[PDB]
Ligand binder design. Sequence first.
Ligand code: PJC
Length: 286
Amino acid sequence: TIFEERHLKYISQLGKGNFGSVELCRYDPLGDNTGALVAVKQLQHSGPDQQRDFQREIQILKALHSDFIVKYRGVSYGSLRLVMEYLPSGCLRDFLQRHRARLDASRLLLYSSQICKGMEYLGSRRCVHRDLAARNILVESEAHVKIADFGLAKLLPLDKDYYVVREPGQSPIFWYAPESLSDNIFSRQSDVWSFGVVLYELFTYCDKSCSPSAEFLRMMGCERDVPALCRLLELLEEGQRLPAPPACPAEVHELMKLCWAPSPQDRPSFSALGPQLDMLWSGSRG
Ligand SMILES: O=C1CCN(c2ncc(C(F)(F)F)c(C3=C(c4c[nH]c5ccccc45)C(=O)NC3=O)n2)CC1
């Protein structure tokens, strides 16, 4: 499923960040502005090692088939461009901030359940996302979200249930499991930890003032003579966690705290979380 680079007409820039250079394009082979809109990712000034990692990302997405994972469309020029379905409602983070006044707990629990199903499917494929965050969730419609941004995703080794990542660059440390922060260990259970942070983001409607980073930076205290990563590990080791968001049901906060168990094996699986989020979405008494 090769897309000709001359048929991809540039419309606008969706964004530029760690997730690459993403452009909204029209795939117009007839050349009449009739074609479908697509999201096109490229790595700008990308060396042969970065391009090899990109080819790997493309192959993960190509083999993924879920209604709760953004749909792979194709590749362009084998420099290399990844072609994805375009979701015009944007990221979940911005949608929650904008429609907060009319999104209730049941609607937040519906998104949580969909993310959890997508993550259960990802785990059955032995793939670790490594960057679950509201920013990396796309809105398909009012009642449908999809997991996006597979730039950090890894396929687990055939004989191991964890992946050790030795790569340069900055990490979103305030979304990361303690074993990821301390020893660069990633797994389906470190994805469960980040899912607990996604739950916290949903129930704060992604309010920037009480974001995971703003909360943890406040918890550290007034003293800043210790590097943040060392202070964050100390906080987590002594049992400090993000607080219960205002108006967050007590049972949703109980699921967050379980996702944030210090031991990866003590964290619930996406399989076990899903039916519990569905039950909470129903509004039924437990
Ligand atoms: O803010 C973010 C940044 C992380 N994120 C994301 N990262 C990468 C892609 C890519 F594969 F297209 F490159 C897409 C993606 C869009 C995007 C839709 N809106 C944006 C805005 C910015 C960047 C990418 C997209 C899409 O429609 N289909 C996709 O796969 N999304 C969710 C939005």
